Amino acid sequence: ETCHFQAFWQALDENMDLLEGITGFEDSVRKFICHVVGITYQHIDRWLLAEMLGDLTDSQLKMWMSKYGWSADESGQIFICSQEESIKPKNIVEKIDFDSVSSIMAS
Amino acid sequence: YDLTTRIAHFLDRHLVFPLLEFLSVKEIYNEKELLQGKLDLLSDTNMVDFAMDVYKNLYSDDIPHALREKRTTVVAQLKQLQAETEPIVKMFEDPETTRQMQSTRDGRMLFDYLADKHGFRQEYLDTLYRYAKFQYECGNYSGAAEYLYFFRVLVPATDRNALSSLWGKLASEILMQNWDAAMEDLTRLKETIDNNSVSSPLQSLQQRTWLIHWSLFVFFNHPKGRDNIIDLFLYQPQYLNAIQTMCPHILRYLTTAVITNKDVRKRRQVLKDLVKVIQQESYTYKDPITEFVECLYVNFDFDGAQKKLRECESVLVNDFFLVACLEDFIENARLFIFETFCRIHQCISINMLADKLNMTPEEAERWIVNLIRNARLDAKIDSKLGHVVMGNNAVSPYQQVIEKTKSLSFRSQMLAMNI
Amino acid sequence: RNTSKQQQQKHQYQQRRQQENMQRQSRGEPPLPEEDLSKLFKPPQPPARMDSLLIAGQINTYCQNIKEFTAQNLGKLFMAQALQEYNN
Amino acid sequence: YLVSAMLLEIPYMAAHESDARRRMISKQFHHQLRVGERQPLLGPPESMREHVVAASKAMKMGDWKTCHSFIINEKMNGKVWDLFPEADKVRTMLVRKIQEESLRTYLFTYSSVYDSISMETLSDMFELDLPTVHSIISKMIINEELMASLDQPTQTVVMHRTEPTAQQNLALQLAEKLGSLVENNERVFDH
Amino acid sequence: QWLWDIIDEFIYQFQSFSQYRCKTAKKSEEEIDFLRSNPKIWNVHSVLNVLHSLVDKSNINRQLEVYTSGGDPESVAGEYGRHSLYKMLGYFSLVGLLRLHSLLGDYYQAIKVLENIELNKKSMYSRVPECQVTTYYYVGFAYLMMRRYQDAIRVFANILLYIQRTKSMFQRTTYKYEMINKQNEQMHALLAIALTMYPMRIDESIHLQLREKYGDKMLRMQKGDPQVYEELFSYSCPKFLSPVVPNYDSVHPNYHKEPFLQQLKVFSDEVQQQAQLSTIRSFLKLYTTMPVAKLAGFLDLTEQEFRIQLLVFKHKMKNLVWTSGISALDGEFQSASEVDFYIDKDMIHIADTKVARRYGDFFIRQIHKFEE
Amino acid sequence: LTSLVPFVDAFQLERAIVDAARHCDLQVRIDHTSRTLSFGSDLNYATREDAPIGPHLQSMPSEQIRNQLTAMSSVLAKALEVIKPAHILQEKEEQHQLAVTAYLKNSRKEHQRILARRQTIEERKERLES
């Protein structure tokens, strides 16, 4: 909930067989990590995305790279989302109100 | 003031002990030293401020004042003269007197125990008479004077003795550097001057000068007493309506106690009632530092201001008067002006700022970013230039009235609508 | 507002003071008729409901509202026409 | 007395007609002036009161170049100038205050027309050096409730405001707030 | 003894009427038709429903917060007292909404957000202001529990406005008129601490008497003192759950503070880290896209100077108030700065002001009726 | 502007522009930072920008916006581009002339029924209403 994903996979104790015993739990939390990365980031480093998902290898990362249609930029980072597609800011002087304000002031 | 129709007959005739002579014919900067021309008079002997002076610039003119004290300890005075290689052959009277005090003491010391032992009032009050007599003769029996005024301060003539005794104690225990015992007189002298014996203008003024010195040595963070000296009596720059009184530092240390311990929203009450009144008009002609600190500030100069403000801080660091907070003034003397300069501003350079106060532009940047963190200004940095921008024009004030002027009437018509 | 001010001060604020001076008079006396109480208690000349404003002035509140309505309306028609004529 | 009044009351009334009008108080010179200001026959001035009225009209138009005769020539004609050795000090104070307020009695009216300002043109128009003019505009914008922003190090000033028709908005705002906050007294009489 | 003579005589009279409420509403239309006719006010029939909302909740909260073991109170009321009245075929008039809002008030004592939408679906009859303000009361509290701060703050603004086109006379919300003032005041104060960069829209929602004190509270809370974490949380607790009566305070009975361990410490976890999200947003985004000068100028603000760095900054950006790019070859941090708009209040007022004209023109035409 | 309009002193010509604008003869951004005067294209256009007493400037104002400027031009100028040039409107307005003629052709038969009644009523109206 505090999005400390590197601390999450460090904090794990691997001798608790109940946490292995929940089916799809280990991937579900990873799918929530990548879910929040899409909403909040435009670009991420290949090493950085790996480490957030529990220090993934080059081959293990291929699943997560393919999952949301992500790709590698020129000699560098992964592409997560376009810049203008991430932010969607709110607006000053939209002022559509006249289509109702004029009709109440009609009489 | 209403007392000042009375003060105007007496024309500065205060009851000083040292009779106007001081460490005369001085070399270095004077508005620092001039305080030992009002203290070292109204405040009787002020000898720690003799010992302070030689360490910055050598004198042998502390020596004539260093002959003439006994309640610190008689023989400390008897050495500083010998150290200056002076023949002073006939020192045969303090060995006579201060010896025969031990012979007198063996009575009172005996009577003192036996009385507080019994818990018997009469044997303690006749002791208190014999002992309040005695403890003005020598102060080297510091624990004896401390034990004397501990149980009873009500002597056979009460307030008259008590005032000159608690004052003689507040004076001597600062010279012993017995700050806890001086902090005991901080409680007791301030009540004894308020429950006044006669209120004669010769003493009423001197008693209000004695309100400075318990705040002044700063062993245990005493400057919070700014909040006491504004409540105990009405606001004044000098607590004496005789304008022939002048302390510079009372306002500098008030300016320190306002800003460094409380919010700057609290400083324009001072800028009116303590930085403009009739005593302070005479003061504004004289002191360089405290003038620059406020006159340049309130005029909203920035160029001469933050330069001559930064120049004050060279004279501040020359201060060997004992305070803890000399440097939090140097801090806030830059902070306080900057907020006010940038308050209505368009665009100030971090580079122009850093050239002035002699810092690097990075320091000035994180300083400005911390002034904005503290939310003392709403501003934003043009990072490319290294300029910082305030730009509120805040047009359209119409809506501020419009909600409430109907929300008042709609709920206030409900009154007359009821019955 | 200043008409209402002065009359409401005769209606209540003077009666407020006169009620206290009646209480200082103990509301009448045994030996003599209540002359000083009766010289305090005289009806002030502006009544409740001063008629000229409450009728003929209020016929002009209605006219003032109708001048504000008339000035508003031509403005409403432009606020429709202006944005929409340029919207093409 | 009347010059000590003039060198405050004109930039003060220029602010009042910039709708800062809640600072108006009775017995001030505006009521005394009215018995002359109501008369049509206002030819060239030939009395000390009329010289103050002509200086007042020029200052109520923002002009210190016409006022040179009202500061000097008419004080010599009235034999008022010669009466102090401090008249050389008064001349300097009058000139400096008149420069400050012939600026401000322009600013309070031209605020609907401004956008940005050259401080060099202020030192040419009003004689004052840039170190001094830096304080003068700061003392206004900190206190007098105007909407400007100041750039002392780039010799520049800003306003960027809108709606020159605001006098109707502000006159009706006063008409309506002196409704809702006056209206409550009738309820306090009723209770 | 006078205490539980009053308490027991409420519940035993409600358990009596609970059978009459199930018996009338379902099937006996001649008994309801006979009840339409005789009085001049049907308001007496209606008020007894939501009169017993808050009075029964008081009496059951006493019995709940006195018996903490071998639970009699909570399963009797939950099974019989609540669901029998509400679940079955409803009364053939607006009375069906009143028992729905009574049940919603009982549902809200269980800290939940699921059935509010299913209750809203069954609120088929029209939203009269009397029912609608009390719907937005608990629906806004559900959005407050849902972490929809941006939504719940809009919902608390309308219900505190007090221009809602009703006279509201004749005791319809009695004994608790200022609870609607102080609970909407209090619960709105928690939401503002999170999201103060969007809300320019504050001015109609809370009055300047309270905005001044609550304004400085938020700043004093997030920036420089955890003191406001205490005093805000003290006032927030009796309002967030609404425990109608705290039981008699004495040390001889325990019995009461034990349920208050859980009730209080449940809301401890809510305001805990949701407050510590605020201080990150508190330092306003001075420069929208930060170069090395401003990124390092903000890493100094992120937390202490240490041999591990940037990772806490990368964590703090994942919450709902940050969206960003990191460019690796530039080494650059690009970020969203976000706001709403100042000029919306007036066009919501344009009808509200006309209600000050309307009710003005109407009430004096009710006096012009009488003295004519 | 100094090369277009010679004057007694150039600094006093930029003063004269301020002075006239303060006297409400116009309203302009003189005294500016780049020494560019701005008159504005419209901005918040107001009557300070013109002489309202008649025109002291010559009768060439440019276009500016005010209430109903678009609306009333939309009534008349779009109709004038039908009333002045058109092939069409002569047939429509001849059909309207025929309607006006039909109204009179029908109602001037009823003048025989109105006349004698209004004549006797108007003769008797003083005799009756007094």
Coordinates of N, CA and C in Angstrom, one line a residue, chain B residues 30-102:
Chain B
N30 N 32.5 52.5 19.2 CA 32.0 53.1 20.4 C 30.6 52.7 20.9
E31 N 29.6 52.4 20.0 CA 28.2 52.1 20.4 C 28.1 50.7 21.1
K32 N 29.1 49.9 20.9 CA 29.4 48.7 21.6 C 29.8 49.0 23.1
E33 N 30.8 49.9 23.2 CA 31.4 50.2 24.5 C 30.5 51.2 25.4
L34 N 29.7 52.0 24.8 CA 28.9 53.1 25.4 C 27.9 52.6 26.5
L35 N 27.5 51.3 26.4 CA 26.7 50.6 27.4 C 27.3 50.5 28.7
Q36 N 28.7 50.4 28.8 CA 29.4 50.5 30.1 C 29.6 52.0 30.5
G37 N 28.8 52.9 29.9 CA 28.5 54.3 30.4 C 27.1 54.5 30.9
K38 N 26.3 53.5 31.0 CA 24.9 53.5 31.6 C 24.8 52.3 32.6
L39 N 25.1 51.1 32.1 CA 25.6 50.0 33.0 C 27.0 50.5 33.5
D40 N 27.5 49.9 34.6 CA 28.6 50.5 35.4 C 28.3 51.9 35.9
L41 N 27.0 52.2 36.1 CA 26.5 53.4 36.7 C 25.1 53.1 37.4
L42 N 24.0 53.0 36.7 CA 22.7 52.7 37.2 C 22.6 51.3 37.9
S43 N 23.3 50.4 37.3 CA 23.5 49.0 37.7 C 24.7 48.8 38.6
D44 N 25.1 49.8 39.3 CA 26.3 49.7 40.2 C 27.6 49.2 39.5
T45 N 28.5 48.5 40.2 CA 29.7 47.8 39.6 C 29.3 46.7 38.6
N46 N 30.0 46.6 37.4 CA 29.7 45.7 36.3 C 31.0 45.0 35.8
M47 N 31.7 44.4 36.7 CA 33.1 44.0 36.5 C 33.4 42.8 35.5
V48 N 32.5 41.9 35.2 CA 32.7 40.9 34.2 C 32.9 41.6 32.8
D49 N 32.3 42.8 32.6 CA 32.5 43.6 31.4 C 33.7 44.5 31.4
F50 N 34.5 44.5 32.5 CA 35.9 44.9 32.5 C 36.8 43.8 32.0
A51 N 36.7 42.5 32.5 CA 37.5 41.4 32.2 C 37.3 40.9 30.7
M52 N 36.1 41.1 30.2 CA 35.8 40.9 28.7 C 36.7 41.7 27.8
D53 N 37.0 42.9 28.1 CA 37.5 43.9 27.1 C 39.0 43.7 26.7
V54 N 39.9 43.3 27.6 CA 41.3 43.1 27.3 C 41.6 42.0 26.3
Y55 N 40.7 41.0 26.2 CA 40.8 39.9 25.3 C 40.7 40.2 23.8
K56 N 40.0 41.3 23.5 CA 40.0 41.9 22.1 C 41.0 43.0 21.9
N57 N 41.3 43.9 22.9 CA 42.2 45.0 22.7 C 42.7 45.4 24.1
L58 N 44.0 45.4 24.3 CA 44.6 45.5 25.6 C 44.4 46.9 26.2
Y59 N 44.1 46.9 27.5 CA 44.0 48.1 28.4 C 44.7 47.8 29.7
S60 N 45.1 48.9 30.4 CA 45.5 48.9 31.8 C 44.6 49.9 32.6
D61 N 43.4 50.3 32.0 CA 42.4 51.2 32.5 C 41.3 50.4 33.2
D62 N 41.2 49.1 33.1 CA 40.4 48.2 34.0 C 40.9 48.2 35.4
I63 N 42.2 48.5 35.6 CA 42.9 48.5 36.9 C 42.3 49.4 37.9
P64 N 42.0 50.7 37.7 CA 41.5 51.6 38.7 C 40.1 51.2 39.2
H65 N 39.3 50.6 38.4 CA 38.0 50.0 38.8 C 38.3 48.6 39.6
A66 N 39.3 47.9 39.2 CA 39.7 46.6 39.8 C 40.3 46.8 41.2
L67 N 40.7 48.0 41.7 CA 41.1 48.2 43.1 C 39.9 48.2 44.1
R68 N 38.6 48.5 43.6 CA 37.5 49.1 44.4 C 36.3 48.2 44.5
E69 N 36.5 46.9 44.8 CA 35.5 45.9 45.1 C 35.9 44.9 46.2
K70 N 35.0 44.4 47.0 CA 35.2 43.6 48.2 C 34.2 42.4 48.2
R71 N 33.0 42.5 47.7 CA 32.0 41.4 47.7 C 32.1 40.3 46.7
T72 N 32.9 40.5 45.7 CA 33.4 39.4 44.8 C 34.3 38.4 45.6
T73 N 35.5 38.9 45.9 CA 36.4 38.4 47.0 C 37.6 39.4 47.1
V74 N 37.8 40.0 48.3 CA 38.7 41.1 48.5 C 40.1 41.0 47.9
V75 N 40.7 39.7 47.9 CA 42.0 39.4 47.5 C 42.2 39.3 46.0
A76 N 41.1 39.0 45.2 CA 41.2 38.9 43.8 C 41.5 40.3 43.2
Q77 N 40.9 41.3 43.8 CA 41.2 42.7 43.5 C 42.7 43.1 43.8
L78 N 43.2 42.5 45.0 CA 44.5 42.7 45.5 C 45.6 42.1 44.7
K79 N 45.3 41.4 43.7 CA 46.3 40.6 42.8 C 46.4 41.3 41.5
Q80 N 45.3 41.7 40.9 CA 45.2 42.3 39.5 C 46.1 43.6 39.5
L81 N 46.0 44.4 40.6 CA 46.9 45.6 40.8 C 48.4 45.2 40.9
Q82 N 48.7 44.1 41.7 CA 50.1 43.6 41.8 C 50.6 43.0 40.5
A83 N 49.8 42.4 39.7 CA 50.1 41.9 38.4 C 50.5 43.0 37.4
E84 N 49.9 44.2 37.5 CA 50.3 45.4 36.7 C 51.6 46.1 37.2
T85 N 52.2 45.4 38.2 CA 53.5 45.9 38.8 C 53.4 47.2 39.4
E86 N 52.5 47.4 40.4 CA 52.2 48.6 41.1 C 52.6 48.5 42.5
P87 N 53.3 49.4 43.1 CA 53.5 49.4 44.6 C 52.2 50.0 45.2
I88 N 51.6 49.2 46.1 CA 50.3 49.7 46.8 C 50.5 49.2 48.3
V89 N 51.5 49.9 48.9 CA 52.1 49.5 50.2 C 51.2 49.3 51.3
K90 N 50.2 50.2 51.4 CA 49.3 50.4 52.6 C 48.0 49.7 52.4
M91 N 48.0 48.4 52.2 CA 46.8 47.5 52.1 C 46.6 46.9 53.5
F92 N 46.5 47.7 54.5 CA 46.5 47.3 55.9 C 45.1 47.3 56.6
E93 N 44.1 47.6 55.8 CA 42.8 48.0 56.3 C 41.8 46.9 56.0
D94 N 41.8 46.3 54.8 CA 41.1 45.1 54.4 C 41.5 43.9 55.2
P95 N 42.8 43.6 55.3 CA 43.3 42.6 56.3 C 42.9 42.9 57.7
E96 N 42.7 44.1 58.2 CA 42.2 44.5 59.5 C 40.7 44.1 59.6
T97 N 39.9 44.7 58.6 CA 38.5 44.6 58.7 C 38.0 43.2 58.5
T98 N 38.3 42.6 57.3 CA 37.8 41.3 56.8 C 38.3 40.2 57.7
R99 N 39.4 40.4 58.5 CA 39.8 39.5 59.5 C 38.8 39.5 60.7
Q100 N 38.5 40.7 61.2 CA 37.6 41.0 62.4 C 36.2 40.7 62.0
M101 N 35.8 40.5 60.8 CA 34.6 39.9 60.3 C 34.5 38.4 60.7
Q102 N 35.5 37.6 60.6 CA 35.5 36.2 61.1 C 35.2 36.1 62.6

